[PDB]
Design an enzyme around this catalytic site. Sequence first.
Site, short mmCIF file in Angstrom:
data_model
loop_
_atom_site.label_atom_id
_atom_site.label_comp_id
_atom_site.label_asym_id
_atom_site.label_seq_id
_atom_site.Cartn_x
_atom_site.Cartn_y
_atom_site.Cartn_z
CG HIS A 158 1.08 -17.40 46.07
ND1 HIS A 158 0.55 -17.31 44.80
CD2 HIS A 158 0.79 -16.22 46.69
CE1 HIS A 158 -0.04 -16.13 44.66
NE2 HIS A 158 0.10 -15.45 45.79
CB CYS A 159 6.15 -17.26 43.50
SG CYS A 159 6.96 -18.82 43.58
CD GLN A 160 4.06 -16.74 37.81
OE1 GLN A 160 5.11 -16.13 37.65
NE2 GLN A 160 3.08 -16.76 36.90
#
Length: 148
Positions: A89-91
């Site tokens: 994940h990231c944003q």
Amino acid sequence: MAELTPILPFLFLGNEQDAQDLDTMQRLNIGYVINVTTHLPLYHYEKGLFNYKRLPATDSNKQNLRQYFEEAFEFIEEAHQCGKGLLIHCQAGVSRSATIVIAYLMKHTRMTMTDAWKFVKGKRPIISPNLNFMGQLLEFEEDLNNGV
Ligand SMILES: CSc1scc2c1-c1nc(SCC(=O)C(C)(C)C)ncc1CC2
């Protein structure tokens, strides 16, 4: 609560709000987490449940992600080899995380850049674009179809 878009039975894609959902991560037998940011916290680290890899990158025009390609693949491989799922994940844009997921599919399923892109798009439709990252994936395709 959290869309943990399942790319493959052992590989999940999400954003920051998705990584903060412990029940979902335990329901889906996720034991590994790749956080592809610098500033977000490694959610649930103090709980002693998951193993982690931070890929310290930013959603930028200059950021190199190919450097982290081999790292992320070796983690994906440990989760599968150990029979547990991985959430990368990231944003909100999942631009950084989606680049890495696609990179995995192109090398380890031997899809094309676009064929993997149609595959991921169909499961998670909303994905902020990044033409810097697309160029690296194309650079990666050249290098995969050459042996480098
Ligand atoms: C491998 S992406 C790809 S390949 C061929 C096309 C595209 C594309 N991608 C996006 S957003 C996804 C991204 O930019 C990443 C964060 C995964 C780098 N919007 C429009 C298009 C049009 C055509």
